Design a protein around this ligand. Structure first.
Ligand SMILES: Nc1ncnc2[nH]cnc12
Length: 247
């Protein structure tokens, strides 16, 4: 029962509905009124991995497998063949795409390794409906180009997983789809991606609404904004937290 998103005639609303469905499946609870992913140590492995279907048409689609403990993309599938990130958890292949031939990709799923293999940083790689359409077609074609494999995963990871995590990012992608205008992730988006764990930890370890360790983000105007409390307006950007601790 994959959660589905189609690029064909995609709209602001259809993308929003996709992210909302993904967020609702990923949610394991609320901490300080903010959704949090499940604690991996008490999660049953049969409940750990979910699939998203990304389609360009009724006859051109791929699937991506997601670890609900951290919203990580750990694998993708085209037809009878699947491909797992080098650092996919051992159990991922026991539950995802088990009726396929499962291959191991040569790169880790980290931005560091993906950017290394793509020979491009996140800042350089366009996001938006055309980028996603192009990536779906590339994975469905089965092309062996590892540079484009890494670039394509950078696109999918941000338009699916980072979008699920951050309201700022889902909205930015929604605008791209609405307007038909591709975009490069801005410094605010990059800083959110880079600080998800730190923000999740700040919220969940907060004492009287104040973070034990402060978090430095960058704002839409390339200015650095310090976040140290639950009341910081930038905290409203968190749609899903990584589980760190119960408060
Ligand atoms: N593979 C991945 N999936 C989701 N978020 C990520 N952030 C960095 N790598 C990621």
């Amino acid at each position: 029962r994959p959660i589905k998103f189609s690029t064909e005639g995609a709209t602001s609303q259809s993308y929003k509905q996709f992210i909302e469905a993904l967020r609702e499946r990923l949610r394991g609870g609320l901490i300080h009124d903010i959704p949090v992913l499940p604690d991996p140590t008490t999660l049953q492995e049969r409940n750990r991995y979910i699939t998203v279907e990304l389609s360009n048409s009724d006859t051109e689609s791929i699937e991506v497998g997601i670890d609900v403990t951290n919203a990580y993309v750990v694998a993708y599938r085209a037809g009878t063949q699947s491909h797992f990130l080098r650092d996919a958890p051992s159990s991922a292949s026991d539950y995802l795409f088990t009726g396929t031939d499962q291959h191991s990709l040569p790169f880790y799923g980290t931005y560091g390794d993906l950017e290394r293999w793509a020979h491009q940083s996140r800042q350089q790689i366009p996001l938006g409906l055309q980028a996603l359409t192009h990536g779906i077609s590339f994975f469905r074609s089965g092309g062996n180009d590892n540079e484009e494999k890494a670039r394509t995963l950078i696109v999918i990871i941000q338009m699916v997983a980072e979008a699920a995590r951050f309201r700022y990012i889902s909205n930015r992608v929604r605008v791209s789809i609405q307007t038909g205008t591709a975009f490069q992730p801005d410094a605010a988006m990059i800083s959110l991606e880079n600080n998800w764990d730190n923000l999740s930890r700040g919220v969940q370890e907060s004492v009287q609404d104040t973070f034990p360790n402060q978090v430095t983000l960058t704002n839409i105007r390339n200015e650095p904004v310090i976040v140290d409390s639950l009341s910081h307006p930038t905290v409203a950007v968190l749609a899903l937290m990584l589980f760190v601790c119960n408060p």
